[PDB]
Design a binder for this molecule. Structure first.
Ligand code: BCL
Ligand code: BCL
Ligand SMILES: CC[C@H]1c2cc3[nH]c4c(c3C)C(=O)[C@H](C(=O)OC)c4c3nc(cc4[nH]c(cc(n2)[C@@H]1C)c(C(C)=O)c4C)[C@@H](C)[C@@H]3CCC(=O)OC/C=C(\C)CCC[C@H](C)CCC[C@H](C)CCCC(C)C
Ligand SMILES: CC[C@H]1c2cc3[nH]c4c(c3C)C(=O)[C@H](C(=O)OC)c4c3nc(cc4[nH]c(cc(n2)[C@@H]1C)c(C(C)=O)c4C)[C@@H](C)[C@@H]3CCC(=O)OC/C=C(\C)CCC[C@H](C)CCC[C@H](C)CCCC(C)C
Ligand SMILES: COC1=C(OC)C(=O)C(C/C=C(\C)CC/C=C(\C)CC/C=C(\C)CC/C=C(\C)CC/C=C(\C)CC/C=C(\C)CC/C=C(/C)CC/C=C(\C)CC/C=C(\C)CCC=C(C)C)=C(C)C1=O
Ligand SMILES: COC(C)(C)C(=O)C/C=C(\C)CC/C=C(\C)CC/C=C(\C)CCCC/C(C)=C/CCC(C)CC/C=C(\C)CCC=C(C)C
Ligand SMILES: COC(C)(C)C(=O)C/C=C(\C)CC/C=C(\C)CC/C=C(\C)CCCC/C(C)=C/CCC(C)CC/C=C(\C)CCC=C(C)C
Ligand SMILES: COC(C)(C)C(=O)C/C=C(\C)CC/C=C(\C)CC/C=C(\C)CCCC/C(C)=C/CCC(C)CC/C=C(\C)CCC=C(C)C
Ligand SMILES: COC(C)(C)C(=O)C/C=C(\C)CC/C=C(\C)CC/C=C(\C)CCCC/C(C)=C/CCC(C)CC/C=C(\C)CCC=C(C)C
Ligand SMILES: COC(C)(C)C(=O)C/C=C(\C)CC/C=C(\C)CC/C=C(\C)CCCC/C(C)=C/CCC(C)CC/C=C(\C)CCC=C(C)C
Ligand SMILES: COC(C)(C)C(=O)C/C=C(\C)CC/C=C(\C)CC/C=C(\C)CCCC/C(C)=C/CCC(C)CC/C=C(\C)CCC=C(C)C
Ligand SMILES: COC(C)(C)C(=O)C/C=C(\C)CC/C=C(\C)CC/C=C(\C)CCCC/C(C)=C\CCC(C)CC/C=C(\C)CCC=C(C)C
Ligand SMILES: [Fe+3]
Lengths: 44, 273, 255, 51, 325, 44, 51, 44, 51, 51, 44, 51, 44, 51
């Protein structure tokens, strides 16, 4: 089992779950903002 | 990530102000009261510079130019687009430099060594303040400062030098140039001597201070020593900075005519036939 | 003169070649300066997960004089201290350390010393470099004020003894140490003070770093005619630690 | 989303709080200064013009 | 306050040091006789001499003296052999390079022959001094870093005096031997070929000069700061690391995020100092032979700034208003 | 269990509760200020 | 794809989070500034023109 | 066998498999973007 | 080749990952900027013209 | 030609791999940039003139 | 046998085989690219 | 003439190979640039001339 | 037996025998390229 | 003439070989450049002048 940071497999899984949970929320907010901006002044 | 000998030096105390409120590290960097002030001032200055670049119409590093106001505004405030951003950035830069010097003071106090480095940095700060504060204040307008551009702060130097016909005839300019050249030569010689002493030809033993002393006494007939060379270099650099400041500050508010004409005192002495 | 293509001419070629050479030179210079203190460690003494973008350099060998062997770098840390009386003030990295006992007596903080070799430094002839002035033939004071015989005043205005001798550097003709004979009230024996931490006046010599009560615990030399690198380090750093640990007001914020 | 509190098992508040305190004031000052450099949103010249 | 270690409190004097030796027998050419200066002992060492007298040194001394005497006697003859007028106009006289009409041929004595003779002598003297500095390092068993750093400046010397006139095909492209004339040559050279600010290699040389001055200031301050731990004995710190090196490194690591070693800082210093004349000579060699206008070069390569406002005093004020009438 | 700062689960939950309580008040004040500014001088 | 969680056995999350935050703020600032250097998408000048 | 980093064969196989999966995902997204851009404004 | 997994027995994954992460973003930024410096592919000016 | 595998008994592969990567990327970028400086091989200008 | 890097003959053979496989893949891709470019706009 | 293999007993091959590679690449690039400098041997302009 | 680099007769023989093959292959490729270039556009 | 080999009884071949190589290359390059610098002996321009 390779580990440079000293973590365990389960710890990595539990970290990645919350990381992706936050990433999806960030992306959703960005998508809503982009949709509103495109409705305001198009670029395509 | 620390060095293998760093941990025993990382103790608490030695702060001018703040106590343990800001006494910690971020990576290798040390944080304090003045670290916070430095970060704030530097970030504000950089973001304001890029805002001005965006409003100018170019993001090219070679072509960004933020300029001081016109001479008609005097010592008052100008509109932020007509040169006020320059004043704000100047204030931020002064604050950041002072905070950097005081942070160096705090680090020196914590490590238990002398305060020579902040004192040396104070001379460069003095030269900058003379360039942007003292000379414009004496001349009567903030428009005498140099612009904040990579290639536009050389046109200012050229035009200011040619405003006195021949700037090479300034005696303080002569002194400063001589000090600069001497400092460069001394640094080259010191580095070469130390490297040659520590790196002999292959298969040979290393050398010591006696060998260096003999070498320079054989070479030129005199040796300054391992302790006098550092004093000499520090003094040369400080003198170069001080005389650069003097040369720039005497050009505008004290002398007005051309610099070659200043030698008429020598050319017209009564002793000559 | 003509151009190879577009606006590219000899000057541009020279500029780009200099760019490449400067990049390689910067790489070489940065890599050359990583022969001491690596690999990096965390605050628990273990190897850190991050080591930087510059890999470690290759080995070089130094051949030392007087038959003291060879030194190869980069290598293991032979100047490492063994048991430090320090305590963590946090569970993670990036926070200071707290002394456990007496920092001046335990050699931590600004009083820290390095484990150097326990042998004196030699000159070209193979003699000890630093020698007392009473054993150096033909040496005498030529300028300034002679400190021998003058009383010594501590950092709090206490007289602890008289200056009895000077230890000089024969090879370079420079004074290195001042020897002090202590009064029975303030201790016993003799102690050394480095020349860089004293101020010689016409009637007295003042040492502002430490107080009167700190003079009896200055490290002593094993031999009366020579001093080793380890002893110099411990004596010299003990004197430096007083700028912070000699008083409570020197450690707290000045405001 | 319900496990966002685990960030405090990663970061000590003593550094995060000072970082956020610097960042928020920097943001507010820049934004106010950027507003002050326009012609339509400069509330100092607007008062002079309106009077 | 604490002692700052700028001037020595008390001096000591012992028997004079004659120098180390080996089987090369350096003693046979060294002089006998030394002196002591107490005035200089406040800063550095007090012993003066002895010096090593080889053949390269004697040749260089004699030939440089010949060059000096030629220049001085020409300047004296140019004024009518009047000593008061020679003293009065000392900073204004010179020994002028030949006229442009003679190309690379040998000009008459009135229009550049003495200049060529003196230049030949000066070249011989400089090369002799370089050979001496190489030979001394070869006989003491040391590295040859001093010779390389001298050759770095000799490169710019030769470019300014020998290589560029040959490439341009005229002996009139050299520098006159005078105090004010050489500054005049600098300014005229800058004006004639556009603006030397927009030469990138002049900028690089300026960068390295500024960096070298900054680096000596920093290193001097750092060494004087840790001198209470025996920090001025750098070689023993390199061979056996002490607390002074650790503190000096930790200061800069905590200040700017990276540091050096006791031996690696000298490599930085050597290169910043050496890189200035090399870049300067490379930049000077390209002027006229390749590029004839540097402002036009900058404009064509798109890094010349543009200005919007107008020119003239009448666009900003009035002549009567300036006088206060 | 993964914990770099030495805190437990309950302490982290309490800290997050207080932090969110502060963040919501900051955001509400900013929203009110932005509404007033938009009523004064619209930018859309 | 189901094994992307093994990146944290190589990189320490404490450094990655700081680097990612700095990168995201710098990118957002650069984009918001680039939009303001044009004429079609500069909302301050558009607000000025529509009044 | 030869190993300059101290790893073993199985760990290298696992690491390369995950890296390859990520590379293919990135390449697929880039391909979709390039196709859309070409449809909008064709070069060549 | 089927045996391309042995590159990780010669190189350290951490340094490679950091360098590749820097390289990809630098390349993408350079390509987008090169696109913005033309006339047929500048989308801001194309949007301005079509309005 | 069969004994060409012994070149790894002289050079360390770790150095050669990095040098080769840097050289390859620099050469590719230089060639692509040289193509753009002409007028017959600039695909951006060719696409612009073809509409 | 002479060796400056510490590798043996078999390991060198294996490395060279892998390196040559990668080189041939790169060369084939480059050949396809050059052929397409020459067909589109021929030099010579 | 047949004893030319003895050169490796005087020169260290490690240094010679690196110097050879650098020199060969620089010479080839310089010759190609010099060929491009002319007007008859520039193959990029000949394609446009023949079109 | 004169030696300065540390090799023997057989090792130097093998090294030169390997080197000459690459030298001749490079020379042959260069000759073919120069011949093709001369046929394309003679310079004599 | 017969005893010319005793030049190795004085000089170190290691330095001589390197100096000879560098000097020969520099001399050949300088002569080629000098020939190119003229007008009658420039063979690149001669091909164009004969076309
Ligand atoms: C026509 C042009 C005239 C001329 C006109 C002038 C004028 C006008 C000036 C001088 C000045 C100088 N001239 Mg002159 N000069 C000429 C040509 C020459 C020649 C020559 C021909 O060889 C030489 C050798 C010099 C050299 C000099 C120096 C003596 C001096 C430079 C000041 C200095 O270094 O202060 C160094 C001090 C500083 C300003 C450093 C400041 C540093 C600050 C405090 C810190 C910076 C922090 C930074 C922002 C951090 C960000 C980086 C992060 C990593 C991101 N001149 C010609 C003849 N000269 C200048 C001078 O004396 O200035 C006082 C000056 O203004
Ligand atoms: C109007 C003036 C022009 C200008 C014209 C020039 C010209 C022309 C030149 C310089 C050059 C230089 N310029 Mg400029 N320069 C200008 C403005 C500036 C400014 C500024 C405004 O602040 C600065 C900082 C500088 C400074 C510099 C240096 C960076 C550089 C000198 C290289 C060097 O190492 O010199 C140090 C000097 C030497 C090393 C000379 C060689 C010394 C030899 C070895 C002497 C031998 C000893 C002797 C024979 C024996 C003496 C007797 C003994 C007692 C025994 N320039 C303006 C724009 N500049 C030079 C350069 O390289 O530019 C590319 C140069 O030629
Ligand atoms: C910037 C470096 C250049 C340089 C520097 C230099 N040379 C020096 C010194 C220095 C700084 C000395 O201090 C030393 C000297 O004695 O100066 C008076 C010397 C010296 N370099 C000399 C020559 C010399 N150096 C050369 C080289 C150089 N000089 C460098 C290029 C050359 C050249 C270019 O060819 C020459 C010809 C000798 C004249 C001298 C070597 C000293 C010697 O051999 O004997 C001197 C000792 C004595 C017999 C007594 C001291 C001499 C005093 C002048 C008389 C009494 C004074 C009293 C004892 C104190 C002096 C007061 C101080 C203010 C000096
Ligand atoms: C890295 C580049 C820097 C540099 C480096 C550098 N210079 C060097 C060296 C190095 C590494 C040496 O080793 C060499 C040296 O000897 O240093 C002590 C030197 C040197 N650089 C010098 C000068 C110099 N360097 C300069 C600059 C620089 N050199 C750069 C900034 C400059 C300028 C314009 O900035 C100058 C003027 C000399 C001091 C010295 C070269 C000595 C030499 O060549 O002497 C030849 C001999 C003669 C010309 C005979 C002169 C005869 C005199 C008429 C009398 C005898 C001399 C006497 C000491 C003077 C008069 C004394 C009076 C009391 C009578
Ligand atoms: C013998 O002896 C000696 C040595 O020894 C042996 C030496 O070695 C040396 C030293 C010499 C050398 C190493 C040679 C090389 C030196 C030079 C060429 C000199 C020139 C140097 C430079 C060009 C580089 C200098 C770089 C500078 C000044 C910039 C670095 C500074 C920063 C990045 C910021 C400083 C950090 C601060 C203030 C702390 C952060 C602030 C806070 C409030 C912390 C709160 C948290 C946050 C804000 C968020 C997290 C922050 C982050 C990540 C910071 C980064 C932020 C960004 C926005 C990027 C010498 C002289 C010597 O003689
Ligand atoms: C137009 O052309 C120019 C050049 C001008 C451009 O503008 C070009 C622009 C680009 C090329 C831009 C490119 C931009 C990117 C590639 C951006 C990428 C951004 C991301 C991948 C962002 C990801 C962010 C993810 C986040 C924030 C996710 C989660 C965070 C958290 C959940 C925080 C909390 C974490 C916890 C609690 C973990 C702890 C858990 C335990 C179990 C301990
Ligand atoms: C338009 O273009 C330009 C470039 C000009 C711009 O202006 C660009 C602008 C941006 C890109 C702006 C971006 C802005 C952001 C991303 C802003 C983000 C802001 C936040 C996330 C703010 C968070 C604030 C949180 C706060 C205030 C929380 C709490 C505060 C407290 C005081 C609570 C303190 C907590 C305690 C005491 C807990 C103690 C508990 C224990 C158990 C001990
Ligand atoms: C047109 O002319 C000019 C010059 C203008 C150009 O534009 C020229 C341009 C070029 C010459 C461009 C050339 C570009 C390249 C050669 C680009 C090459 C790019 C790559 C090879 C990219 C590869 C990316 C691969 C990635 C991102 C793969 C995977 C990543 C991850 C899976 C991330 C997660 C990692 C994990 C989980 C590690 C696994 C760990 C374990 C413990 C199993
Ligand atoms: C027109 O004129 C100008 C000057 C403008 C020019 O353009 C001039 C141009 C030139 C002169 C160009 C010259 C170009 C060359 C000489 C190019 C040469 C190119 C190569 C030799 C390329 C080699 C590429 C090799 C590759 C890609 C190899 C890849 C290998 C691998 C991916 C496998 C890696 C190996 C492993 C993992 C070993 C296994 C490990 C074990 C432990 C067993
Ligand atoms: C026109 O005028 C100007 C000045 C512009 C010019 O252009 C002038 C140009 C010149 C004067 C040019 C002159 C050029 C030369 C003299 C060129 C000479 C070139 C060579 C001698 C090249 C030799 C190349 C040899 C090669 C490539 C050999 C082998 C290569 C290999 C990769 C194989 C080696 C492998 C080995 C040894 C494996 C190791 C084996 C073990 C058993 C360990
Ligand atoms: C016109 O005015 C100006 C200034 C322009 C001039 O141009 C003026 C020019 C001059 C004044 C020029 C003057 C020129 C001279 C005085 C030239 C003199 C030249 C010589 C004396 C040349 C001698 C050459 C000798 C040679 C080449 C000898 C070679 C010998 C060998 C190759 C044999 C080697 C011997 C060995 C190996 C001995 C081995 C023995 C053992 C025991 C080991
Ligand atoms: C008569 O009264 C007495 C006896 C007291 C005197 O002798 C008085 C003497 C004086 C008052 C002398 C005063 C001297 C000066 C003021 C001198 C000033 C000198 C300079 C500023 C000199 C600068 C020299 C050189 C410069 C700036 C650059 C480059 C030069 C060279 C590379 C020179 C080398 C020349 C060569 C290689 C060409 C030689 C020609 C050949 C054909 C080989
Ligand atoms: Fe030093």
């Amino acid at each position: 089992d390779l580990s440079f940071t000293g973590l365990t497999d389960e710890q990595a899984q539990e970290l990645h779950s919350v990381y992706m949970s936050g990433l999806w929320l960030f992306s959703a907010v960005a998508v809503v903002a982009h949709l509103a901006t495109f409705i305001w002044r198009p670029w395509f | 990530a620390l060095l293998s000998f760093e941990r025993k030096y990382r103790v608490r105390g030695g702060t001018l102000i703040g106590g343990d409120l800001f006494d910690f590290w971020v990576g290798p960097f040390y944080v304090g009261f003045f670290g916070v002030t430095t970060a704030f001032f530097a970030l504000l200055g950089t973001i304001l510079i890029f805002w001005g670049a965006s409003q100018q119409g170019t993001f090219n590093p070679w072509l960004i130019n933020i300029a001081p106001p016109d001479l008609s505004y005097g010592l008052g405030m100008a509109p932020l687009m007509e040169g006020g951003l320059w004043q704000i950035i100047t204030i931020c830069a002064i604050g950041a430099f002072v905070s950097w010097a005081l942070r160096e003071v705090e680090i020196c106090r914590k490590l238990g060594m002398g305060y020579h480095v902040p004192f040396a940095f104070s001379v460069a700060i003095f030269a900058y303040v003379t360039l942007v504060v003292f000379r414009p204040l004496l001349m009567g307008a903030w428009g005498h400062g140099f612009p904040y551009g990579i290639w536009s702060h050389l046109d200012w130097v050229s035009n200011t030098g040619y405003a006195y016909l021949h700037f090479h005839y300034n005696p303080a300019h002569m002194l400063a140039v001589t000090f600069f050249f001497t400092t460069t030569l001394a640094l080259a010689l010191h580095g070469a001597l130390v490297l040659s002493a520590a790196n002999p030809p292959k298969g040979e033993e290393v050398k010591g201070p006696d060998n260096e002393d003999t070498f320079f006494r054989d070479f030129i007939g005199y040796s300054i020593g391992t302790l006098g060379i550092h004093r000499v270099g520090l003094l040369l650099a400080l003198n170069a900075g001080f005389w650069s400041a003097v040369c720039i500050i005497i050009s505008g508010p004290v002398w007005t005519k051309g610099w070659p004409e200043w030698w008429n005192w020598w050319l017209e002495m009564p002793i000559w036939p | 003169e003509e151009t190879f293509f577009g606006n590219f001419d000899l000057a541009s070629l020279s500029l780009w070649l200099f760019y490449g050479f400067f990049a390689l030179l910067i790489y070489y210079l940065q890599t050359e300066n990583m022969r001491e203190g690596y690999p990096l460690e965390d605050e628990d003494g273990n190897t850190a997960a991050n080591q930087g973008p510059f890999p470690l350099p290759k080995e070089k060998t130094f051949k030392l004089q007087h038959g003291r062997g060879e030194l190869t770098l980069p290598g293991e840390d032979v100047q490492r201290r063994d048991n430090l009386a320090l305590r963590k003030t946090a569970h993670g990295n990036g926070f200071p350390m707290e002394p456990t006992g007496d920092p001046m007596l335990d050699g931590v903080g600004p009083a820290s010393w390095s484990k150097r070799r326990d042998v004196p430094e030699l000159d070209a002839h193979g003699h000890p470099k630093i020698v007392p002035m009473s054993a150096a033939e033909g040496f005498g004071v030529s300028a300034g004020t002679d400190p021998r015989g003058l009383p010594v005043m501590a950092g709090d205005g206490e007289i602890v003894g008289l200056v009895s001798d000077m230890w000089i550097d024969e090879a370079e003709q420079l004074v290195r140490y001042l020897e002090l004979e202590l009064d029975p009230e303030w201790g016993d024996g003799k102690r050394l003070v480095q020349r860089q931490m004293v101020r010689i006046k016409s009637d007295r010599v003042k040492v502002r770093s430490i107080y009167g009560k700190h003079f009896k615990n200055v490290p002593k030399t094993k031999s009366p005619n020579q001093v080793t690198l380890l002893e110099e380090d411990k004596i010299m750093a003990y004197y430096a630690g007083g700028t912070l640990y000699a008083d409570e007001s020197r450690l707290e914020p000045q405001l | 989303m319900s496990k966002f509190y685990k960030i405090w098992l990663i970061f000590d508040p003593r550094r995060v709080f000072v970082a956020q305190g610097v960042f928020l004031f920097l943001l507010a000052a820049m934004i106010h200064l950027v507003l002050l450099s326009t012609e339509h949103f400069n509330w100092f010249e607007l008062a002079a013009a309106n009077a | 306050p604490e002692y700052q270690n700028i001037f020595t409190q008390v001096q000591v004097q012992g028997p004079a040091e004659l120098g180390v030796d080996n089987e090369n027998n350096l003693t046979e050419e060294r002089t006998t006789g030394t002196g002591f200066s107490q005035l200089i002992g406040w800063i550095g060492n007090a012993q003066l001499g002895p010096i090593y007298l080889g053949w390269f040194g004697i040749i260089s001394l004699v030939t440089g003296t010949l060059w000096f005497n030629i220049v001085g006697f020409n300047m004296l003859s140019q004024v009518g052999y009047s000593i008061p007028e020679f003293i009065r106009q000392l900073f204004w006289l010179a020994l002028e390079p030949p006229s442009p009409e003679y190309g690379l041929r040998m000009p008459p004595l009135d229009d550049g022959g003495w200049f060529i003779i003196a230049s030949f002598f000066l070249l011989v003297s400089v090369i002799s001094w370089w050979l001496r500095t190489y030979q001394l390092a070869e006989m003491h068993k040391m590295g040859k870093h001093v010779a390389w750093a001298f050759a770095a400046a000799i490169w710019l010397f030769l470019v300014l005096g020998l290589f560029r006139p040959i490439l341009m095909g005229s002996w009139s492209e050299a520098v006159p031997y005078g105090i004010f004339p050489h500054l005049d040559w600098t300014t005229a050279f800058s004006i004639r070929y556009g603006n030397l600010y927009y030469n990138p290699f002049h900028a690089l040389s300026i960068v390295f000069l500024y960096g070298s001055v900054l680096l000596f200031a920093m290193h001097g301050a750092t060494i004087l700061a840790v001198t209470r731990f025996g920090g001025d004995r750098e070689l023993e710190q390199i061979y056996d690391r002490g607390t002074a090196s650790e503190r000096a490194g930790l200061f800069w690591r905590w200040t700017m995020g990276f540091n050096a070693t006791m031996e690696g800082i000298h490599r930085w210093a050597w290169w910043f100092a050496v890189l200035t004349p090399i870049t300067g000579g490379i930049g000077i060699l390209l002027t006229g032979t390749v590029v004839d206008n540097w402002f036009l070069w900058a404009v064509e390569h798109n890094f010349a700034p543009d200005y919007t406002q107008d020119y003239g005093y009448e666009a900003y004020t009035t002549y009567d208003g300036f006088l206060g009438r």
